[PDB]
Symmetry: D2
Amino acid sequence: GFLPHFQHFATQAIHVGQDPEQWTSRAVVPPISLSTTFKQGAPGQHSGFEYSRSGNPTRNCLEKAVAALDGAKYCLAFASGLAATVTITHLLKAGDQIICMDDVYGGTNRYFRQVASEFGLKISFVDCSKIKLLEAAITPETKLVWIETPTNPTQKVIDIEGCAHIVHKHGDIILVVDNTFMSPYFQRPLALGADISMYSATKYMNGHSDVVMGLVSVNCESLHNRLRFLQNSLGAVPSPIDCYLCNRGLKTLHVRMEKHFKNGMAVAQFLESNPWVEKVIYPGLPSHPQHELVKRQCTGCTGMVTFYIKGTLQHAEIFLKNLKLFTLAESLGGFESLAELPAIMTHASVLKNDRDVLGISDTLIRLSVGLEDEEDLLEDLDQALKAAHP
Amino acid sequence: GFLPHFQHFATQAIHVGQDPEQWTSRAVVPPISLSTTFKQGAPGQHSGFEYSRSGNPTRNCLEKAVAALDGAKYCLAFASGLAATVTITHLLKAGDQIICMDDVYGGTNRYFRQVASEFGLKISFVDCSKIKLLEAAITPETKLVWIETPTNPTQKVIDIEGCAHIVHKHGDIILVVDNTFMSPYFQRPLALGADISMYSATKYMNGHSDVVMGLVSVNCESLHNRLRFLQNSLGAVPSPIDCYLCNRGLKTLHVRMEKHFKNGMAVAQFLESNPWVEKVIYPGLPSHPQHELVKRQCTGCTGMVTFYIKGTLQHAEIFLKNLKLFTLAESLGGFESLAELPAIMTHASVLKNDRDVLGISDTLIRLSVGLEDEEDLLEDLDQALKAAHP
Amino acid sequence: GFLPHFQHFATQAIHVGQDPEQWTSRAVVPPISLSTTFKQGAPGQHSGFEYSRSGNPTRNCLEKAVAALDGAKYCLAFASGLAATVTITHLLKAGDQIICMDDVYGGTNRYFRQVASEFGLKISFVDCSKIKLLEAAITPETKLVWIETPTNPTQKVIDIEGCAHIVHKHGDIILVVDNTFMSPYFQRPLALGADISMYSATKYMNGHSDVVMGLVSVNCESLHNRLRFLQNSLGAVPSPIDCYLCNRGLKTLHVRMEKHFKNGMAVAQFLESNPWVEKVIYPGLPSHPQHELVKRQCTGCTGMVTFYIKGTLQHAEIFLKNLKLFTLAESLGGFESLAELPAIMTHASVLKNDRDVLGISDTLIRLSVGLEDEEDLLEDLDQALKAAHPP
Amino acid sequence: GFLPHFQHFATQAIHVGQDPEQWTSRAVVPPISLSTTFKQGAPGQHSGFEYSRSGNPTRNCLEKAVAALDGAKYCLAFASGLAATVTITHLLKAGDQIICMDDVYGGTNRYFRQVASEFGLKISFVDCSKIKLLEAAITPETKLVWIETPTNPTQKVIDIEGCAHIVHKHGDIILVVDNTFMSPYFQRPLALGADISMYSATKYMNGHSDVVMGLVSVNCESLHNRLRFLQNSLGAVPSPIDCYLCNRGLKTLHVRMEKHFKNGMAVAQFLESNPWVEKVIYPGLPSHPQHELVKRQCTGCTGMVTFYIKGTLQHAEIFLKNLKLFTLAESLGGFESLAELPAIMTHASVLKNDRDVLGISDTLIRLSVGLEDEEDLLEDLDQALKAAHPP
Ligand SMILES: Cc1ncc(COP(=O)(O)O)c(C/N=C(\C=C\OCCN)C(=O)O)c1O
Ligand SMILES: Cc1ncc(COP(=O)(O)O)c(C/N=C(\C=C\OCCN)C(=O)O)c1O
Ligand SMILES: Cc1ncc(COP(=O)(O)O)c(C/N=C(\C=C\OCCN)C(=O)O)c1O
Ligand SMILES: Cc1ncc(COP(=O)(O)O)c(C/N=C(\C=C\OCCN)C(=O)O)c1O
């Protein structure tokens, strides 16, 4: 009972922005234009490219492609997911209030809490997975609501349309959905009411663990113009080569994501029947408390699997160190399988008390299940878990 | 009469950061490491790389090299010069004041005036080429002084040592020198008393018009810690590949800059004796009002030449359109000769009344003299001036 | 009834040659080492890297991965598919005979026929889809037997094990299978008895239409050493950056190939029941004359679909011009769907009378079916054939 | 008293092939086009490019640039210097004879001696610095004369114009000058009567020790057509990214080479008055036997310096291992200073007897003087020689 798959996604992934008639050569694959600058026929004419930071062919093609996948009119590429976040935050002004989902990427939490807040911005962390708590937290000063769904790393799921409805009822408030964990193949926040669909393109979008990049998709004309002004003005922009690599990565997004789904489901089911696993959190399992909502707003699920190992931090460490195919490393969304302990690694930057409230304990482990053979991945988890409880 | 050239500069540019012993293969040129993430031996210990945004081999090699050329302990690389400015500005907090050199790159002007100033930062533009005016403008809230020298585009020259003394006498104020126009081959702000030596590496540093990048060199330990936190936390970071190309650009910086000097001087001398030129501003000309100061704090001069054409905007435009070797385009500091009209191009983002007070008029033309044959460059300027004045 | 898929393929494609422990940084993805040269501690002893052309980490990492995917001990990367052919041909010497499959890529034809033949090498083109013909064509001077299966573009299928048995009965004769059309995901010539498995990596291996490259995988120690000598000595070597890009492409080879199969089969089934198609040639269709053999030596089929449109060259040209999704262009094996007319494009380099004999006529169209939505591809083909509506 | 410098060289290096009007974006630097294939308006009717191996925008831009710098009509780029050599040799046919300079890069030696010779090609190695010897070596079968000047590594200098007169007097013989050591900034073989000017672009041309590549410049129309055929048909082609990086390298070629000249001259003179040094071979020194010829056919000299250390192999090894700034490594022509012992490294591929005849002993050391500070370079050589301190 998942949402039906988005029509023409693959066709668009491979072709939007990639029209050969853009190039004098009629190249089937867009060239990588590194050039910082472009010849102009007259001073002050507004006909064509001018300066790479402001706009450049390879970035522009990638932005077109991503926009289409998001069902968006526009998209803006950035130097990283965090830099996308920073740029979006600069839409605001001193005196403004930001509401942020209480469970998010550690660095996002850090940015709002320790940086943005220093500049006249008030930050409230709210469990938006309970729509009425969101409602209760909105103030006349609220200008931005930042959510992940599923959240990193406890994978709480948020009713995007329900949040949209509440957020847009009064005033002028921007709803951002960081769609990093799902990719637009599986979830389209703009279709559900968000004003912005945002990515760490570093993860599934590129999918090849070799590009650090952020993406921001948007429909609203005024909102886009404001964002485009800041892309140019803050200059947190991606290399044109990275744009090329990410675009290239996009061409297999659909077949990569389907295999992440299959492998992730297999891993989740395996862990849930494992005697050395205390609890599994995976949107595609009925055991996930928002599983039905997941099927309502998503076309499938990804490779991210969270689980609590039995025992203590020491068991968690022995498990991680015994993995032979999963790699103990940060990040996610690549072809290769990764494994992490968020409380000590990606989410060390989250306050202890917040970690405890959120349940990011010493025994919470986060998996990014890759595209390897399913049997090899299950064998690796099986032996590492036995190694941990001898 | 210039400062003696900095010793070992070429040796350092070619070898700092490039030690083959860093790589298991003993490669003489550092590999390009795109990997977003790195395998860790145990959860949460910090004895290697962890995530590309935070640090990565190719970026770290570049930073090491640039720090050396600046005579600095540390350097941080960014996605663009503007992103370097953005990151430095995040060192501050609401309530703080910034003094900016009155003549700067249009985008820098724009960032402080229209963006930074919305987040609790007060911005004052001051002609710091008159140290008296800088002294008067410092308040108890001043935390940062941003200068360019020579300025873009009217090439006013600031006494860096003099300003450092004024700024550091009073409290804890950061002095930044945007050293984009001179490069570290010709000027070392940190040796002169500046706290930060900053670049749009997009220009001479890379030197090849195919990389957008910022660079920030510093000595002070806590200033570095704060900047490094912001590199990682705002994530306005460069591609490892771009880092490679910039590093590669650096291996010829010395021989490129010496040729920029000779060509620049020859072009400046030619224009000044040309009957269709009203005024030439080139720090290497005795006519430059700070010529003696330039020899006191620089080892030589670059290829940036500013001049005013006799006549009106129509004459400037006809000149620019009849250039056949110089290219009508924005940016600077490449091997290829570039020409532009700042009022209508790079500095259109400066308010027209500021442009008039600064002298950035319809007839101010900025040249970035490249590395082509001298006689070819002079002949192009000659015929184009005649074209504008038949 | 296809052969079972090869075990641990995806695991190997993603991890072989990619061990983080190779690098001081412990990078999960191998760095791109551009460096031409390497600091040595031992002049005259070959215990480290020395010179990029001879060997370098990014190429070596790639070669290891491909070798594993081929079930091979060794693999050598080259500047292009044709460069791999040229290097393999340098294994021989004046007075040797090459036997080449009568239907091969036009440039392979051209190279043997117009170039190799000028340097003391006898070339015979033989229909090796008939084993008796190979058998009867072998002479005492035969040193090399070069096959494609399925052939480009008429897609005759060759019994690899049967030819291997025939060829090795005579002794020192190298059997090469150019496995460009299948990829190691669907066909493993080395497990079938071939001495060499070769690729234009430009096609499916890389898969992203942005790298020109050749690959040669081998088991024999002696044969490997001879090929490695020629990799170094002829220097038709690929850029380490290209090597990085191809190896990146490898990591989606399994999921790419499965979708090419799905899309290819659907395209083939649609064309075969279309009133405007004369004949379809697709290994996965029961109508294919070697279908049973395909199932016996392959684990599946790819996106390469060949067919004859009814009518004349004019109908082929109206069909091609009306395609809105398929792109008229040479090459194959990329994420993007392509169509071409071999007689005028990729196989213009085959002499017209040879073209006639092989059936590469003015109505032969070759499709490389990409990874787009099936429905969209089928619709594109449908409306383009209606545009042409030949008698 | 050198040749006056070639006019507009820098202007051409920076702009030839780089016209912004080529690109819809009007980019000042040509884009890197990785695309293997290109959309056609109709079968066999393309917009200029068909397939990357055959031609691509980024390679063509580079080829145009290099041709200009050589003063040539045409240029072809290849995967490596060896691959350019292989491709040129394919111009010939069984029964043809090749004369090769007796002192050349070891791989060039090896290719002719062990590979080319196996395919009906006769190889003669001849000291062409004595023109009567070349003339005596010419037979009716002679079709190709391959010279380096200065030679790698003993830097014998050949009278290119003298040799052109002799060779062309005797009929349709192709004279190739491998101009790797000099670069077209300092030497133009085509203006001196050579038919081909050839490079390992891997060295000074790229200049940055991060690209393996070959280049071939040529004026003769029929010669161009034949080479172009072989570029496409053999496929020993460079990555477009490598082409980009090589073009990028070119734009600093003039300022790089002037500095290689200054530093190289300083190193040569330092070595020549050093007590632990037996002999120095540098074209820029009056002590070089062909110094006066060097000034007649060149506009300056490069960073390649050859010397004999006093003592034995032991002493040469200790010298090399004690270098702190020079890097003990192969290759040459980079920004970074390199040092090697040819007899057991780059020229181990030369037969030991041939090595003795040529003077490539265990004490011949080859320096590639890079662009570092002169005093640091000299200081490094000084402490290293002191470290070995032979008799
Ligand atoms: C959901 C989400 N949004 C935004 C970002 C920031 O994107 P970036 O700037 O890195 O492109 C991340 C990074 N997520 C991780 C990155 C970790 O890096 C290690 C430093 N904590 C992770 O492993 O969970 C993320 O998981
Ligand atoms: C002195 C100086 N500092 C910083 C920057 C910003 O660096 P970036 O973010 O571009 O790396 C520039 C850009 N200067 C120019 C760039 C212009 O193009 C953009 C349109 N204004 C110029 O040509 O004057 C600069 O000239
Ligand atoms: C089966 C096969 N082997 C080898 C090659 C040569 O590989 P390369 O050198 O291109 O990497 C090809 C090229 N096949 C095609 C090449 C077309 O190129 C255009 C020039 N005809 C094709 O589309 O059929 C091929 O199809
Ligand atoms: C004059 C000359 N021509 C051609 C080549 C071959 O070009 P390539 O295929 O490498 O692009 C070389 C290589 N020269 C050296 C190559 C060393 O490689 C290591 C093995 N010899 C050298 O250091 O002397 C050369 O010096």
